[PDB]
Amino acid sequence: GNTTSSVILTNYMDTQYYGEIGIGTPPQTFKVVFDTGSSNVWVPSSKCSRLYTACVYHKLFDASDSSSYKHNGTELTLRYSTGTVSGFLSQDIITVGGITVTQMFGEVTEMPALPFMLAEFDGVVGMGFIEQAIGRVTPIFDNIISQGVLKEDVFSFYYNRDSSLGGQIVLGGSDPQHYEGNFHYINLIKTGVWQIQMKGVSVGSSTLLCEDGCLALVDTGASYISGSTSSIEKLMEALGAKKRLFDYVVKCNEGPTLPDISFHLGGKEYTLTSADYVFQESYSSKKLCTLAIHAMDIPPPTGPTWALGATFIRKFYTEFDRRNNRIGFALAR
Ligand SMILES: CCCCNC(=O)[C@H](C)C[C@H](O)[C@@H](N)C[C@H](Cc1ccc(OC)c(OCCCOC)c1)C(C)C
């Protein structure tokens, strides 16, 4: 076809990038993360008990105020790298950047506070494959694609640095005014998942890890670049960072000196300069700066896998190809 679309996203501390969709006729407006790490849509429900503090803090979906809603009813529990939300199915029309589809989503009535009370966004839009869709529910992209409207079965993400535009997705294409040089594609390893083959991580100058080929799931819904606890740990040893419970960190003076890390994808090497990965809010001997890499163990469903999140997409404009099943990288401008 010939439509092309984008949503515009807001960047929050570089750690959380959301855009907005509208469910229901009259629209209910919710804020959401467009995640390629999963494949289901959910937003909080009015039915959620406000004994859950998260619900008192996020907009909820009232469907009895929606003329288009449509009852469903099966339960559905979503598990993620880092939190579960439980709830039930339903349908109404959703509007993502001017394209309206009728999608089956989940109304969550169980939303745990941690980490939910810390999320600026209301829910999630999985841009994953049918395959990873819990409930075996068709996802937004496949439905949009059914409409016959895009010129291409492709969506791309721009994540900006921070403090105009926070980001931008474009459905049915790629804005050439946010990339440079050529795109470079990596074919999808199995299908029904955004996983690509990853050839080795270099810290500084040598493959400290990844060495016999590994998995890198490219995931827009994640904020940091992460790996198994076990290679994380190692990499960390190298760089010379500590643990803080959840994130490593280095002393700020040290900061603008940690070597570069590289990611070996398709004969090309994606290097991240030290600034790209440290969150430098100081340069002082006495203060701790944390890094934008983590440990995350994603289980055999798909993991173990390294996840390349926002840290990475923000440097390399990413296009995800449906028509052809692969992922291409280009340099963000
Ligand atoms: C159902 C199978 C799940 C498959 N995918 C995964 O497990 C991924 C590795 C992790 C998820 O994609 C995860 N990032 C999604 C995300 C989890 C999450 C929870 C709390 C957060 O805030 C403290 C958060 O921050 C996300 C920031 C994204 O901004 C771009 C993400 C929401 C949408 C559920």
DSSP code string of 92-150: EEEEETTEEEEEEEEEEEE--HHHHTT-SSSEEEE-S-GGG-GGGPPPHHHHHHHTS--
Pairing between strand 225-227 and 249-251?
A: unpaired
Q: Is the CB of 33 under 6 A from ligand 1?
A: yes
Other CB atoms within 10 A of residue 116 CB: 20
| Ligand 1 centre distance from Cα of residue 188 (Å) | 21
- Amino acid of residue 292: A
CA 16 from centre of chain:
9
Q: How far is CA 160 from CA 26, 112, 226, in A?
A: 32, 29, 19
CA distance 160 to 166: 5
Q: Is the CB of 113 under 6 A from ligand 1?
A: no
CA 57 from centre of chain:
22
Q: Is the CB of 193 under 6 A from ligand 1?
A: no
Handedness of CA 278, 284, 286, 287 (dihedral sign): negative
Cross-sheet strand order for the sheet of 167-171? 5-7, 167-171, 154-159, 318-321, 326-332, 179-187
Catalytic residue, chosen from 14, 35, 153, 321, is 35
Structure's resolution in angstroms = 3.1
Q: Are 115 and 82 in contact (CB under 8 A)?
A: yes
Same fold, 4-174 and 175-332: yes
Radius of gyration of the chain (CA): 20
Q: Are 265 and 186 in contact (CB under 8 A)?
A: yes
Name the closest-CA residue to atom 15, ligand 1: 221
Other CB atoms within 10 A of residue 207 CB: 14
- Amino acid of residue 143: N
Domain boundaries, the chain: 4-174, 175-332
- Amino acid of residue 303: G
Name the closest-CA residue to atom 12, ligand 1: 37
User: Experimental method for this entry?
Assistant: X-ray
CA distance 110 to 159: 30
Name the closest-CA residue to atom 27, ligand 1: 16
Name the closest-CA residue to atom 20, ligand 1: 115
Q: Are 58 and 42 in contact (CB under 8 A)?
A: no
Pocket perturbation via mutation, ligand 1, pick of 82, 168, 218, 225 by most ligand atoms within 8 A of CB = 82
CA distance 245 to 207: 27
Q: Are 96 and 144 in contact (CB under 8 A)?
A: yes
Q: Are 330 and 182 in contact (CB under 8 A)?
A: yes
Q: Is the CB of 231 under 6 A from ligand 1?
A: no
Atom of ligand 1 nearest to the CA of 80: 7
Q: Give the SS3 label for residue 218.
A: strand
| Ligand 1 centre distance from Cα of residue 81 (Å) | 6
Q: Is the CB of 135 under 6 A from ligand 1?
A: no
Active site residue 153: no
Pairing between strand 268-272 and 83-96?
A: unpaired
Active site residue 212: no
329 conformational bin, left if phi > 0, alpha if psi -120 to 50, beta if neither: beta
CA distance 307 to 221: 10
Q: Give the SS3 label for residue 46.
A: coil
Catalytic residue, chosen from 122, 153, 219, 321, is 219
| Ligand 1 centre distance from Cα of residue 217 (Å) | 13
Other CB atoms within 10 A of residue 204 CB: 12
CATH architecture of 175-332: Beta Barrel (2.40)
Residue entry with tokens 């028509």: 323
Q: Classify domain 4-174 at the CATH class level.
A: mainly beta
Convert 170-201 to b/e letters by CB count within 10 Å (16 or more is b).
Answer: bbbbbeeebbeeebbbbebbeeebbbbebbbb
Pocket perturbation via mutation, ligand 1, pick of 12, 32, 35 by most ligand atoms within 8 A of CB = 35
Cross-sheet strand order for the sheet of 306-308? 195-198, 214-218, 306-308, 225-227, 293-295
Q: Is the CB of 274 under 6 A from ligand 1?
A: no
289 beta partners: 250
